[PDB]
Amino acid sequence: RLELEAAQKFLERAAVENLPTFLVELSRVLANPGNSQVARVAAGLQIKNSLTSKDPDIKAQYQQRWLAIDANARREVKNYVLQTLGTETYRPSSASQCVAGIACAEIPVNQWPELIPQLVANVTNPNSTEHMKESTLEAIGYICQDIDPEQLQDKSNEILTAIIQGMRKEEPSNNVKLAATNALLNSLEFTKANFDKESERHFIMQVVCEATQCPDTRVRVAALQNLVKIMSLYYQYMETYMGPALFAITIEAMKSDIDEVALQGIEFWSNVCDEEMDLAIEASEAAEQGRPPEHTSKFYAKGALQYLVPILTQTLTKQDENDDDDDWNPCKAAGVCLMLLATCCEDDIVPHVLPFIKEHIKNPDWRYRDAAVMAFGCILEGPEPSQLKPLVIQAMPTLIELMKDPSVVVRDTAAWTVGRICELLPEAAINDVYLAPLLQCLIEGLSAEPRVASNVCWAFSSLAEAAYEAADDQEEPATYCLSSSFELIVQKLLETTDRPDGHQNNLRSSAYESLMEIVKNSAKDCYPAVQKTTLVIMERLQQVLQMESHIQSTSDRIQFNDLQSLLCATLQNVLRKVQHQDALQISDVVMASLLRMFQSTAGSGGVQEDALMAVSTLVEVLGGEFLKYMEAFKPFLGIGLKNYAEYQVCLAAVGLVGDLCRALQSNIIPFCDEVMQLLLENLGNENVHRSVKPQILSVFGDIALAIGGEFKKYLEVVLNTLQQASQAQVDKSDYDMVDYLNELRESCLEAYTGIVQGLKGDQENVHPDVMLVQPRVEFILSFIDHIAGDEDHTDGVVACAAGLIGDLCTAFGKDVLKLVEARPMIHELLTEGRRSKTNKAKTLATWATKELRKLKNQA
Amino acid sequence: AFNCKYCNKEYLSLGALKMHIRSHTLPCVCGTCGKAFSRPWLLQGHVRTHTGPFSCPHCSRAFADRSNLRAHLQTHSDVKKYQCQACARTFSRMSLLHKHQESGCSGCPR
Ligand SMILES: [Zn+2]
Ligand SMILES: [Zn+2]
Ligand SMILES: [Zn+2]
Ligand SMILES: [Zn+2]
What we know:
By secondary structure, chain A is mainly α. Chain A has one domain: Leucine-rich Repeat Variant, CATH 1.25.10. Chain A has 40 helices and no strands. By secondary structure, chain B is an alpha+beta fold. Chain B has one domain. In chain B, the strands form three sheets. In chain B, strands 1-2 form a two-stranded antiparallel ribbon. A two-stranded antiparallel sheet of chain B has the order 3-4. Chain B has a two-stranded antiparallel sheet with strand order 5-6. The interface between A and B is large, with 65 and 42 residues. Chain B: It is found in: Nucleus; Cytoplasm. Chain B: It comes from Homo sapiens. Chain B: This is Zinc finger protein SNAI1. Chain B: Belongs to the snail C2H2-type zinc-finger protein family.
C-alpha cells in the first residue's frame, strides 16, 4: 500500500483540479509503446474509470462531464486512444475500453461520427496486423454492448461487415475470430433488417455455423452462444437452418467431452423450451379467446425430443459425489433441460425417458441409479397427472428404499423426487396404500443429511396442504389423515430445528416453514397441539432474533423476514379458527412477537405491513379488551404512520387506526392526539404517495365517530383540509388521475359523514356539537353538486354522496332541503343511485331520498 | 372426488386442486403487472424485480418482450444463479425463477 497513496489519490488531485490536462497526458502515456505495460494499462484504466461506471447514474453523470471538456482536448484524447489499437501486444488491451467509454458519451449526441467508419476501416484494411483487427473488434464489441442499439441503426451494416470479416474461416488468427465472434454476440440486435431478407440471412448463419467448427474451443463456445442468441431474436427464421445445420451442431455439442461446449448445446435447447413455452401461452391465451396467433410455434423441441432425451439422461450419469452448489456442470444442466422439456413437451416426454428409468433404477453403479430416479422426478410436471399417477406407484416403495441407499447422492435425489411427488402429485402419498409407510420414511429422513432433510421438510409442507384440502378449506374439518401423527411430526420438525447443522441447505428455515405450514393446514382435533406448537414457534423465533439478528447475512435476513412474514399469516390463521377463549389465552405472546418485527427488522425488508395486518386480526377478534395492548402498541403504530417511504406500510397502519376506532370506540381518546398529529403531518408532506391521503381522510371520519365531541379540537383544521381536497381538479384526459379524483372524493364524503354522525351522537335528538359543522353544509352540497355534473364519477362516489345527504337531513333538517332543490343536479345523482346495480348506492340513495321527502312533508 | 369450496369447479387430481385453491387466497396485488400474492412480503419481493415491462437483474436494462430479454442475458457472464428476493432460494435460469416467484415461492431445486 505504501506506493498506493502516491498513486490512487495523486491521480485524483489531478482529475478534479484539471481533468482535461489529466486525460490528455494519460492518453499520451497510453499511446506510446515505450513506457511499461503497467503504467500503460494504469493510464488506460484511469481513462476508462473517468468515463464509465457500473452505476448507471454516475455513468450518465461521468458522460456529461466528458461532453463539457474543451473539444480540442477531447480530440487529442480521441487521437491517442484510437492510435493505440495495434500497438499494444499484451492482455486484451486497455485502449479498446477507452474507445467505448468515450463513444458511449459522444455517439448519442452525434459528436464522434468519425469513429465507426474508422473502426470498420481498421478491420477491413488488408494491411492491418493481428493486434489492430483484434483490439478494434473488441472495441466494437464494447460499444455495441454498452450503447443503445437505436443509436447505431444507421451504421449497423458497417459494424456487421467488420465483424463478419473477422469471423470468416479464411482469417488465419483465431484470436481475431474470437474477438469478432464475441463482438457479434453483442451486435445481433441491429442486424434485424439483414436477417429479414433470406439471402442476407443465409450468409450470416453460414459464418456463425462455420465458426462452431473452429478447432479453437473459444471460437466454438462463442459461436454456440451466438446460436442461442439468434434463436431468441429470430425464432421465426430458423426453420431454414434447424434441419440442415442447427440440429447437428448443437446435438454434437451436447455430446462433447468439453464441459463448456456441452453446456452451450444444452442451453440451446433449454432456450428453445423457453421460447416455445412462451408461444404455447400466446397461442393459448388472448389467442382463440381473441383472434388466433400471431407468432406460431414451429415445435423444434417436440421434434427433437427423440434424440435430445437419450443424450440428456446419459449426461445425468456424469456427476460428482460432492460438487457443492451452485455447481454448474452438464449433469446439472441436463436435469434442468429435461424438466423444461417436460413442461414444454408434456406427455410426449414420457415414452422417451421411461425406458431409461426402468432399466437403471437398480443398476449397481450409483451414477446410473441416481440418474434414473432423477429423470423420473424431472418429468413429473407437464404431462397429464392421469398418465402420471400409475407410474409413481411402480417406483414409490423403490423411492422409499432408495432413501436408505448406500450412496449419499442417490439418497439426496430420491428425497427431492419424493418432495416433488408430494407437491405435484401427492395422490401416491395421500393414499391408504402408501401414506403410513411414507410418513415413517419421512420421519426417518429428518434425521438424515441436511440436503435430504430439507427436501423432507418440503414434502411435509406439501403433504399437509394436500391432506387439509382433501375432505371434509373453510369451514375447518374435524379430522384429517395427519391427525394421528400431528404431534409426532411437530416434535420431529422441532428436533430438526435444533440441529447443529441446521444452517446447511436451509434446513432450520425449511423446518420452521414446515411447522407453520402444518399449524395452518390442520384439522380441528389437532388444535390443542396447534396451540402449543404455535407458542413454541414464537419463543424460538424470538430467540433467533435476540441471538442472531446482528450476525445475519443478507440472505439470512431475507429468509428470516420470510419466516416472520409467514408467522404473521400463521398467527392470523390460528386466531381466526380457535375458540375465542383460547385466542385470549395466547394473545399476550402473539402481541410480543408482532411488536418485535417492527423496524428493528429489517435493514433489508421489512415485514411491518405483515405485522400490522396480524395486529388488525387480533383487533378484530378481541375488539374492546384489545385496550390492554394499546399502550404497548402505540410507538409501533406511530412508526407505521411515519413510514412514507414504504407507503404500503403506511396504508396498513392508517387502516389499523380505523379498526382501533371501531374496537375501542371512546377508549381511543387518550391516543387520538398523537395519531391525529401524525395523520395531519402525512397530509402536509409532498413526499408521500398519493394513495395514502384518501385513506387518511376517511379515517378522520372513523376517529370522529369514536370520540364524538372530543373531535372539536381538530374540527377547524380537518374541515378546512377537507375543503381543499374536495376542490381538487385533474386532467379529465388522464384516466389514472380521474380514478384518483374519484377515490379522493369518496373519502372526502366519508370524512364529512363520520364527523356529522360522530358529533350527532347515537341518541335523539342531535347533540349541539353538530351545529359547528352547519356553516359547511352549503359547501358540502355544492361539492356534491359539482360531482353530479361531472359524468365521470363512480357508483362508489354516488353511494357516499347519498349517505352524506341522508346524514345532513337528520342533523340539520329543513335547511338541507332548501339547498338541495336549488341544485337539481343532486336529484339527478340520487336517481342514478336509485336506479343502480350497485347495492350500496341504491340503499343510500333511497334512504337519502326518503329523508329529503320527510323534510318536505315536515315543511 | 375433489372440488373447490370457493367455486365448486370439480377436480380429478388433488395436486391440481391444490394449485387451484391457492388462487382464491391472494389479496396482495401488484400495480406493475397486477400479478397476485398471498403475503405482503411476497408482493414486495416481486416488485424488487421491477427496475421499472421486463428487466435484466444484472444491468437493469428493459426490453419490449421476453425474447429480447432472454437473448440479452446470454451476453452476461458467470451467472448463473437468479436468487429470489423473497425466500433467497436460487435458480439456474430466469424463467425458473419467475415461475417460482409467481406461484407464491413454490418448487425447490435441483
Ligand atoms: Zn375455485
Ligand atoms: Zn409487478
Ligand atoms: Zn443485463
Ligand atoms: Zn421465493
